[model samples]
Target chain A: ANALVVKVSYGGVLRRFRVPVKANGQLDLEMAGLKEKIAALFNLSADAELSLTYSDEDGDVVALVDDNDLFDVTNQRLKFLKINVNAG
Target chain B: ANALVVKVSYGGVLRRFRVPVKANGQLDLEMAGLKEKIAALFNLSADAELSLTYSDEDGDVVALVDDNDLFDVTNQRLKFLKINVNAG
Candidate 1:
């Protein structure tokens, strides 16, 4: 039986903001983590929702009708297989 | 286009006949349903061929056939995320 592992929900104070420097004529700020000078803002119940599912083989989806049935049911999923993210 | 629900066939008679123990209580038999019995048992007109597919996500089938294209192909499939499940 495959399983899905998820991260627990927890709250925390977020910090660390970055801003790209605009210079050198053409300013390209792609993939830049913006940093700010804002104070810390804490969260109460701000837990993340992370999940991981287990499968007999890679790239298999558990059929909703039957738990025993797993297959490649979508085109995007098929793309994952082609990229070697899954092995089946 | 999320409407790919399929549960029908052109010509097929599928039924649910579960088999259990008898009052005699002498065998650990198994799930033996005899509903498939007494059929025409023919091929073509009396077709009797069985091709078993172990798992759509078993072994390394699709990966083998798509050796050339891999995730690069148009109609390709990469399970989950290639950068996660596998790495060469």
Candidate 2:
């Protein structure tokens, strides 16, 4: 059971959601699938422009993209970045 | 004006606190000085054995200690880790 309970931050607000992973340590869904869960978490519009990021090495924040951007669930807690859209 | 506004997470709950940085970019006070602010923010006891952390490269969380663990405020937002003590 490599499921993940991740914390997401948007506009300085935080929320939690669960994402499943397979026994082989692979994510159960594609990166696009995650967008749906994230949108639902924040009630975001279907067309909302969103960017994903997480802290990188050197303790700096970095972008995450593509289905190949795999993650590990060993720590049970994870944080994800939710970049906000520019408001006019 | 390199004042830093940071968000701190404790027990999976989030809170916001601002920390000041001098013009030369070094923190205005010693690292021990931060403990008081954190204790007040979470209503933690002054003797709490708190551990500080932030996201590191490879998207992993790591510990922070001593005055040597300086931070940057370029993003205007920062996350700090707060370790909880075990209770019997």
Q: Tell me, by lDDT, which candidate is best.
A: 2
* Model 1 chain A worst lDDT run, 10 consecutive residues: A31-40
| DockQ per model, Cα | 0.01, 0.02
Q: Which window of 10 residues has the lowest lDDT sum in candidate 1 chain B?
A: B1-10
Q: What is candidate 1's fraction of native contacts?
A: 0.00
Error of 2 at B3 (Å): 23
Instruction: Compute the interface RMSD for candidate 2.
Output: 13.1
Candidate 1, B1-88: lDDT as tens digits: 1111112111121122222334543221211211122122211121333221111223342331222332232123223211111111
Q: Candidate 1 docking: what grade?
A: incorrect
lDDT for each candidate structure: 0.21, 0.56
- Candidate 2, residues B26-71: lDDT per residue as tens digits? 4566657877777776778877677776665345555667664554
User: Residue A40's C-alpha lDDT in candidate 1?
Assistant: 18
**Fnat of each candidate:** 0.00, 0.00
